[PDB]
Write a protein that binds this ligand. Sequence first.
Ligand SMILES: CC(C)(COP(=O)(O)OP(=O)(O)OC[C@H]1O[C@@H](n2cnc3c(N)ncnc32)[C@H](O)[C@@H]1OP(=O)(O)O)[C@@H](O)C(=O)NCCC(=O)NCCS
Ligand SMILES: CC(C)(COP(=O)(O)OP(=O)(O)OC[C@H]1O[C@@H](n2cnc3c(N)ncnc32)[C@H](O)[C@@H]1OP(=O)(O)O)[C@@H](O)C(=O)NCCC(=O)NCCS
Lengths: 388, 388, 287, 287
Amino acid sequence: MNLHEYQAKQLFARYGLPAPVGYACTTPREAEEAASKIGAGPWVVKCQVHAGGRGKAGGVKVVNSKEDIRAFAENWLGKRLVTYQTDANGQPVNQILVEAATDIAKELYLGAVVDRSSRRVVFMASTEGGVEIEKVAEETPHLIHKVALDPLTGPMPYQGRELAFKLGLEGKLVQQFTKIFMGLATIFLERDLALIEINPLVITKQGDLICLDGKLGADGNALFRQPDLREMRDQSQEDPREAQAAQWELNYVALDGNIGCMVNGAGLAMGTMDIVKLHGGEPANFLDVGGGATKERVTEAFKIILSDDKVKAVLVNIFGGIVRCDLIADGIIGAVAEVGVNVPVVVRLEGNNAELGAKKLADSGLNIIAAKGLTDAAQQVVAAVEGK
Amino acid sequence: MNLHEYQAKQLFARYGLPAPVGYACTTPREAEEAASKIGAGPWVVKCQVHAGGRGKAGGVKVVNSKEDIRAFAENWLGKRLVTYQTDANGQPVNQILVEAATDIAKELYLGAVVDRSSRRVVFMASTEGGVEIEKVAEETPHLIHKVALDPLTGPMPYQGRELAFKLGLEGKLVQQFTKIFMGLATIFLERDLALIEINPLVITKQGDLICLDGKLGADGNALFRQPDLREMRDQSQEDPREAQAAQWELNYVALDGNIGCMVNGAGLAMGTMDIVKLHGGEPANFLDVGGGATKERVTEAFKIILSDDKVKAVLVNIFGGIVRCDLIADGIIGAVAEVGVNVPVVVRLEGNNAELGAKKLADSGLNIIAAKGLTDAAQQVVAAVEGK
Amino acid sequence: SILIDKNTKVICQGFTGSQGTFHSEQAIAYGTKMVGGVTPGKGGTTHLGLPVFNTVREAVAATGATASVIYVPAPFCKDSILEAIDAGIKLIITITEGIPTLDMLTVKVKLDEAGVRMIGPNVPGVITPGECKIGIQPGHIHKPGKVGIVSRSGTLTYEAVKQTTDYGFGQSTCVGIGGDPIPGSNFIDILEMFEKDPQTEAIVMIGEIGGSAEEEAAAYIKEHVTKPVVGYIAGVTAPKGKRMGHAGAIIAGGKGTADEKFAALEAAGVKTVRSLADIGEALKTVL
Amino acid sequence: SILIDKNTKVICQGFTGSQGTFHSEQAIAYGTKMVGGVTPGKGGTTHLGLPVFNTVREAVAATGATASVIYVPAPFCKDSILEAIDAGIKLIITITEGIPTLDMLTVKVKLDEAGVRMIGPNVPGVITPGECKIGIQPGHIHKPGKVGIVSRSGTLTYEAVKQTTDYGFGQSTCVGIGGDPIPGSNFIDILEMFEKDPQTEAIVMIGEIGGSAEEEAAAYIKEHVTKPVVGYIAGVTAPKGKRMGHAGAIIAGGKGTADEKFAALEAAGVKTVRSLADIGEALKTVL
Ligand SMILES: CC(C)(COP(=O)(O)OP(=O)(O)OC[C@H]1O[C@@H](n2cnc3c(N)ncnc32)[C@H](O)[C@@H]1OP(=O)(O)O)[C@@H](O)C(=O)NCCC(=O)NCCS
Ligand SMILES: CC(C)(COP(=O)(O)OP(=O)(O)OC[C@H]1O[C@@H](n2cnc3c(N)ncnc32)[C@H](O)[C@@H]1OP(=O)(O)O)[C@@H](O)C(=O)NCCC(=O)NCCS
């Protein structure tokens, strides 16, 4: 799960890591009243949303009057900021972070993730701050530097210095940097983070390192032992459906398309979508039942897939599972009738008595086709939509 | 450095580990007034000294009246408790620990140290509580159980359970034990301890695990990063001379003998003593100059060795060093005159111009012999004392 | 075949739990040599007609088992896996889903260092048709054979498993290496096995978007694998951004795309198939 | 000879400090190939006529050195040793005294795992008479020869070193493994070396009370060493209880006594000597 910028800076603070002085506000009054608590302007107002590119979108501004702060807060709180990292529908702004302006001398990049290839936590540092690192990697690689934490010894200082010297830092800035490396590396391990991204790590005109902007990504799987990160989850930041699909042990994700896919197994799901859009067709989504596919799960699954209206036909593909294909076919029927499914459904049962199951779907009456085989079920779902 | 029992229980507490309710008192009034703060008797009074065997020595008693507590405190505070683990001169009692009596059902043993052989921190558990484990090892080995912490993963729960099951524990006691294992193992690592010894780890009539008595040994070398343990050092518990020898970068330790040995190098020191007591002779002590053997170090070294009066002759054996043998010989002379050494000294210089040095000691006049060779210097120091 | 066989003796950690029970029965009925299980606090009892122990060491000593299968909830796996490693077990199959990535990061180093092999976590298991079955894969869609299967996906494996059984090719051994960011074994581990295995005449490699395990397997295949390999990558229609079911499922940095992997596999000499339905055909070809 | 020689190229960590400076000069004057040193923040300067770098990696890349000697204060060794291990250095000689035992516990595992050899900590160093000298041992009391020396003690080594030079036996190589509870190398490590070394005709093993490294060496000697070994254990007059200079110096548990070790060595076929003065004689005998 992702944390808001302000939440990350809070953590950073907690670990003795420099961040601009500021406050997260939930109303224009709070926003403007924060200007004084901070000091003299100009001040920086930033919408708090999980996606990036907030700058380009005008979700970040530097002002010089309580009037502007007030105006800015007034304009965004409640609205939804849409950046190049948000879906075309953007994300709600429920807090405006108001902090002090920083005298930027140079912008650096510091970040960490779990390198799947080297199977270690890797910290990256670059002199290319304020830039898409993804890009820096592409164009100028030799400007990115890495180190891997040793699971046996923990983050060591010589590593922070190595990066500091690569960045050409010297004097106190080297020690300062080494501290931030040790600090971040510790948060990463102790808080079970999946990613850290200090972009930019600023060197001020005054000559000090400060984290002007930070993005933290936590490891969902570790949340049971991360009570604090657990409480910082901001539901309003991700697609709602995905959220309920979750408590309902489903796994939703939407796409454009017109054909709804309901498969059990993330692999088979992508494979199903792939095969559908191979026979023409257009995958309207990715829904991984979860296997424990019971009748309720199937009824909920149908609701979520059909909560969207671009869906013209639903393709069910259940291979294996904990329930016998006949009981699975019933859940498909009972759900189609209850949720009052109003679309042609093409099922593809597999496993125990998929025979009897396939039949239960033919005699049901409901516009529930019962394809024979993956390849087939494809063509038929593709067919049932052609024209609409 | 060692910690008092009360200091250890404090730490244990800090880590959520069960210990009797009690208080460390420095005056009879405090002692007796603590009885009420605790609850109803009987209560347990225990002298606080670093050595063990306090029980046998009568330094621990179970009382049933404020009058006794008062009496007991009154009798020990200021006195020196002498046990089989203290030198025949005992150790000062400056605190009396007063805690609640415990309903002991069974006594177990839990302890940990750094096994030099396996190069790991090893925890030992046994059902032989209240007994010298050293003994249990000798007689009944199969009753001792061990586990080693993995430097890579840290203390794991399955390890605490392994020990718990060996001890025949079951039910809540297993989980309880596992907790104490995890707790102790953490203190050991986080606080850089060299040893932990919960003897006995008690199972109460009420059916719970509690640390009736604990002994913690910290790693001196890590004290720079152990500010708290650093402040708990109780100077009054170890021989005073050794203490000053320390700030004076010397390394003292006394024995019976009559011949004082002053060597540079712990190895050469024991080797010197060994060779002296090989040619008859009697090593009165072990003093490792430290090599940086300057004139002041030598003058201080002579004071400490001669702060004792069983010393009839001093044997100096300086091989190598940072100062040229002639300058070393001067320090020997200047010290013998200043400290007014009143004993026959037999030096054995080696290294740079040990020639000129050896001479400076002959023409000095002082009763400073200048032996030629290890073997020789021995016989001569042995000789210079024979008769006194 | 690789990893297991008729002789492999297995103990189950988390044996008295819902899933440990249910599947141990299935493995039992398939004829897998289940010699017992472990559940702290239940040692001394018998379950599914087998001894239940408190510690893995007790079980190993008592049964001489060498492989352990884990059905312990995520919050406790690091403790189960590390215990099994320490008890002497040489093959661990962790079915569990949800282990913190940092946990597996450490365990992976341990496993390596201790010379212990682990399939998983987050996997259906491993199966040698006719001989041994450790996991949750449908035993009825398999058939002793000549094709080896490795898959980052669970269900997809089944599609392939059925196809090879349907073309009467049979399976030498099926291995689900799993999804998770840092797994016990990767493609290159299992591939090097199928290569050195006589009974395996051809290989089916199933991957998906995310990471670069496949890209790395590709280079290995090209430089070390000789037997024919048919490959399939899912998630061509998957969009950048969200994680598709698994965490390693996201296609980030403009890398780890399905097409990227396909090409690399192709350039490595691997018979790729665009539709998961033609895996059987592809084999029929190369065989 | 073992460990080092005329060709060994050395870098010094903590090169610009008092001791790093003083002794680097001594090693320099002895003809040891000091190619540079490392001191964070002083990279780019030259010291004792040699390049000073900020990181070990820079130095290794710049000089191709393979051995590093450490003169860094205890509070920072774990960081120096781990850096050197990671920079590719294959031989580390840590002169430092005072490293927390838990630090060396971890480092020891690392060293092993990474195939890196370390003499120390808390040692005088290593010296191959006439060829290479890394440490603080007196170069003037040595003499190229046929006897190899291993010692848990610093100064004692010198007594032995002088005696062998005085009987015109000469030293193949001198190694102080150190006192500290968990050292980089133990007797068995160095012994196995002297054994496989042609130039070494006889061995002198110096130990002391505490632990059981000697007892373990004894069993090794008896089962694997063929060359003659003269042994000496100090601390026969040492009393149980206090630590004699070193932490590993205490004779606890009624074990690790001097006499205990003597016997074991004797039973192993080692020529023991009761007086450190007769080490030369003992050699004269066996040689
Ligand atoms: C592992 C998993 C199956 C467990 O589910 P489960 O069986 O319902 O869990 P239960 O609580 O019923 O059983 C767990 C058992 O673990 C045991 N246990 C706990 N810690 C243990 C340990 N360290 N060692 C051994 N057993 C342990 C307990 O015995 C418990 O059962 P019991 O106390 O009732 O006897 C579940 O967490 C999971 O990961 N599911 C997803 C698996 C998956 O999808 N894999 C992908 C394949 S495609
Ligand atoms: C190691 C020891 C010699 C250091 O003593 P020292 O030279 O006086 O210490 P100094 O402060 O003068 O020098 C240490 C240098 O380490 C350097 N340093 C610190 N951390 C460093 C690191 N990680 N890497 C490299 N150099 C580092 C500094 O450069 C410092 O010198 P500088 O900053 O002045 O240039 C001392 O701590 C010690 O252990 N003495 C006992 C040794 C012993 O008795 N051994 C037994 C043999 S028998």
